[PDB]
Amino acid sequence: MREIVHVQGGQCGNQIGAKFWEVISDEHGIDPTGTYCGDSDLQLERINVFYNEATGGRFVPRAILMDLEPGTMDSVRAGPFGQLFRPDNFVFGQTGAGNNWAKGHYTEGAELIDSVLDVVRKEAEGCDCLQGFQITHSLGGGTGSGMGTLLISKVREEYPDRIMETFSVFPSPKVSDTVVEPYNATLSVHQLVENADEVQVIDNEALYDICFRTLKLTTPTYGDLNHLVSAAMSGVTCCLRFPGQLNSDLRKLAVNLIPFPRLHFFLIGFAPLTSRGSQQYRALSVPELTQQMFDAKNMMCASDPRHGRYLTASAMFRGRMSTKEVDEQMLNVQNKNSSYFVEWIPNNMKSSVCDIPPKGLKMSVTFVGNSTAIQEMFKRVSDQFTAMFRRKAFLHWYTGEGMDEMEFTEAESNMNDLVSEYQQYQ
Amino acid sequence: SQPVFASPLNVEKRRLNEERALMQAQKANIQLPPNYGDMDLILFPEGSLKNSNNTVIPQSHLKGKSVALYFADGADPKCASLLPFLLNYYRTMNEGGANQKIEIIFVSLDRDREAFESHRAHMPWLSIDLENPLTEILKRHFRVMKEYEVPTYGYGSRTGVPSVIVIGSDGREAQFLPICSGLEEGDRALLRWDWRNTKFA
Amino acid sequence: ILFPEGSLKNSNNTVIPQSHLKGKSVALYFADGADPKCASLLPFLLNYYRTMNEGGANQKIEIIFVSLDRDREAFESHRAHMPWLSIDLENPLTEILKRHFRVMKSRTGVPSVIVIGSDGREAQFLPICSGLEEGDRALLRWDWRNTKFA
Amino acid sequence: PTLPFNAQSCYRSEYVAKPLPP
Amino acid sequence: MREVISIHVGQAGIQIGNACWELFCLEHGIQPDGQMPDAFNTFFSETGAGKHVPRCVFLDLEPTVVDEVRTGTYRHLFHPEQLISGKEDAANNFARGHYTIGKEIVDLSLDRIRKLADNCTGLQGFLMFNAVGGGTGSGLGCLLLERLSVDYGKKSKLNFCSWPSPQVSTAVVEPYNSVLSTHSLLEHTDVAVMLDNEAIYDICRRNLDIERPTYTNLNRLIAQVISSLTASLRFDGALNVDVTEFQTNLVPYPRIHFMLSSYAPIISAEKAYHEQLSVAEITNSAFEPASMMAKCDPRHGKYMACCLMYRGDVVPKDVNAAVATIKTKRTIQFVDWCPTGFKCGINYQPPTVVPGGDLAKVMRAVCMISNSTAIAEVFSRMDHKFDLMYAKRAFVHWYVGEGMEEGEFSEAREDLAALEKDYEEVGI
């Protein structure tokens, strides 16, 4: 049938993925040992989309774990749902790309691609016909931003008639992890725009804002924050697994969102986001789901959407809700928030009604949107690159490992060009 | 085998009726096992129903009236909301004629005897006592449950408490009143009742 | 049932059941012998009792007295003032009610007449020693017409 | 590990065994 | 459904509101837990099945009283984001609320109203609750009421004010705060029910025979008036009147919209036992100089418009005869150009009652609202109290230092002078 291969690259990807497989497993009701209980045909009829039977009732996920240091791959092994993964699925580097894109890509990474492609195609050809891939990486680090974008380029040329969606974490406005930040991001954007179909942006600090305000949690760990991405990254792919009235797919929303091939960078929002205190005092309906999903303090990218106009936007509703109440409201918001959208697209919005609500919750929506509000975000990465290039700071750590100074000049030109189209289309 | 197969009323029904079917077939062209159409059962036994005067009435008293079961809990807020409107509907609809029109049976999802009697003091229609097994048998028959406690056999919850089910002579679900259902007409779904074509024959 | 079969005694120290109270307004009187305030409130209460029973053809009001005295020697000595019912100091019921209605020798203290409804359900505090502080005059605001034991 | 999910599709709900015309 | 929205600004309106929504919960039979064990749609929404949520907004710049509402009785029936709390109180300064510190709450408030007002059409009006004398009630009350006038130009909005009394003022800057209030609370609002506090002080001591009350008795008594005002929006009756045709009946010209109130009966269990409150005499007590709630004798003014919601069992016999009696009275003088003056309203629902409060259950009530010229000196009294203090610049530098300008104080002078000039112009 239809298969989605999961690849997890880098430290951030491997952490974020281990929480994702927890959300999928209990959405389908699978014991962490791998066996089945939960008693429903409709949660089970589409299980080959992520899992493979192994003759003891069990499911091993079609996930491959990759990293250039074995530190965080034992983290997922020892931690929750570590028994589920396949030991052959792990691929180790013993050295570690120390936040260096150069050794992520050219020098150090090249001798490990010969192994990671082995397992991926071994899982690929086992089925009838593959549908797509999904990759979790952060564009800050080395073993995700460079070591990941090479695996993007290799599997794309092997199987050009399939798709891929990458959940990517970028830099931040104020606080700044990984002081060689703009080098790894810009070098990865100009590769990611050339070899990948869809990219969901995530920022730590719109994501820090949400848990401070909405969830009302004072000291937020990695576990609870990844649980908030994993629900969204489960929500976008509900429709492949569960039936509904107005069905969707990755390719269904791939063609419906992007007008032109070079701009495919998407924002994510999720709703409802309710603290413990306000949980019993809300009467969850389709109206305020739309009002929650169009909120500047709700999106997971630290861009205020009020600067730009939304170009194309999709809504994967989830549960049993009536459908004029669906469609009439997207009409409402498009007419009411006339300045928020773009005039040269009639019916800016897109809808989908996936028939099974998340577990325990009753009425959920997951908002994906191609905005032009990433004018300010990529011009942020741009001037950070210019600030650290004229002084030529930290260039030696890259140049000494087969890098070229010509690559950085192309990278800025090839990313200032991406800014050009966002501003052009107002 | 309507509306479900795996219900205690239907297992008792099947056992009794084909016991009788085999006996008379041997004693005599008769189709075994008997069709669900051909089967006959007594739904409410001798001492089940008891009215507003605390007097037991037989099943034959319910002939000619649209009867409906009402699964209620004393402490459930939704049931506390639905009760006044069901009472008012009973009031007006039965007052407005020189003929009895509808009748309500009370089936208790309540916790205990005290609370059951306290809640039953408010209702002017018939009821089945909570210690009577017929309450649990009717719950499993019509697949109403507040929580997955009793196993269901690949089915789901038909509804939640509160619910009104217009019934027939043989345990047929004549129609479901959408109080808390796929439609959610809280307090308003009672007007959907087609009392003319669902008489307890 | 608020009171078991033996917590109530009349003026002649003979037990009466729960059922006898019905038809008429009933109040609990939290008090003690030693207190100047109880000494000052007792006679006003006596006159109120007398007039509210005299003016008409029914019994309208009835008082059950709960003691916070030190022991028995004070208990009979302050019970012999009273032509109404009282709860024995040696029954547990006194400590349960004490703790329940929150008089303490903490929000409220002696004296405190509080009218009692159907089942628990105190109707009004009778602001004799409260924020209102209607000394010997709060007594009049009793609503016997509204509350009748049943 | 889950206790069982008991919401049901609209198609399964309502296109059921109707009593037949003869 | 047809509805009305409630706004409480400052320490005055907040605990009035505490007394307000206590009754409405008891009127509809909903417990403080929030659940009961279409008539209420005009004041309460629905949350799932069986849970009802108030449709009000609270607004105050300090959390010292806002927190007190949240941790009180209504922890679960209210909503946490329904209450808006700032950081620093305006502290008896018109300039602190209207100019500097208020701006950070208006953007938060505007968002709330817009989210509450958009969903259902057929809204009817708004209900302010504030003290004129208090700073936040005057300051942040104004800019919110100013902003609502610009946005929903179409829409009715009632005001309820606690005007400073001729003796008791409880603040030194009451004359400054009030005259500044009404310049910017003449134009923006529609109708403003004037109330004084020492008026109700003599109410509690004479009819309700309590020799010293406090705030929880004041707010309990204003809650009965507003519940008798707006029951017609909630429940049915033989003849009911809403918000939108109060202003039709009572406001002849756009400036003259400051009016009094009175409520009969105001009688304890002392005397509800002892006499009828018959229609022939509850209206007589309504016109009595005692029962009015705005501390000015109507003998030295001319009545011009009156509105009388009888609530409870009144047969129309008694109405007509009682009306005719009032015209015959020579002590009550109407203005000659206004032959009719009375807009009767009879409801059928009995009067409501707090439990364990000083209000006795009565089988009929009258809530009389009266546009009269007796307001003329109440405006000139505060004008005189302004004239003393303005004479040498006292307490000006607080207002000036915050961001106001000297000179807008002057603009309020001819504004209030025009208001006193109008009443003496109209009432001849």
Curated annotation (Swiss-Prot), chain E:
Undergoes a tyrosination/detyrosination cycle, the cyclic removal and re-addition of a C-terminal tyrosine residue by the enzymes tubulin tyrosine carboxypeptidase (TTCP) and tubulin tyrosine ligase (TTL), respectively. It is found in: Cytoplasm, Cytoskeleton. Its cofactor is Mg(2+). It catalyses: GTP + H2O = GDP + phosphate + H(+). It comes from the Eukaryota. It holds the Pfam family Tubulin. The active site is at 245. GO terms for molecular function: GTP binding; hydrolase activity; metal ion binding; structural constituent of cytoskeleton. Mg(2+) binds at residue 62. Keywords: Acetylation, Cytoplasm, Cytoskeleton, GTP-binding, Hydrolase, Magnesium, Metal-binding, Microtubule, Nucleotide-binding. One of its GO terms (cellular component) is microtubule. GO terms for biological process: microtubule-based process. Its EC number is 3.6.5.-. It is an enzyme of class 3 (hydrolase). GTP binds at residues 11, 62, 135-136, 170, 197, 219. Belongs to the tubulin family. Tubulin is the major constituent of microtubules, a cylinder consisting of laterally associated linear protofilaments composed of alpha- and beta-tubulin heterodimers. Microtubules grow by the addition of GTP-tubulin dimers to the microtubule end, where a stabilizing cap forms. Below the cap, tubulin dimers are in GDP-bound state, owing to GTPase activity of alpha-tubulin. Dimer of alpha and beta chains. A typical microtubule is a hollow water-filled tube with an outer diameter of 25 nm and an inner diameter of 15 nM. Alpha-beta heterodimers associate head-to-tail to form protofilaments running lengthwise along the microtubule wall with the beta-tubulin subunit facing the microtubule plus end conferring a structural polarity. Microtubules usually have 13 protofilaments but different protofilament numbers can be found in some organisms and specialized cells. This is Tubulin alpha chain. It comes from Toxoplasma gondii.
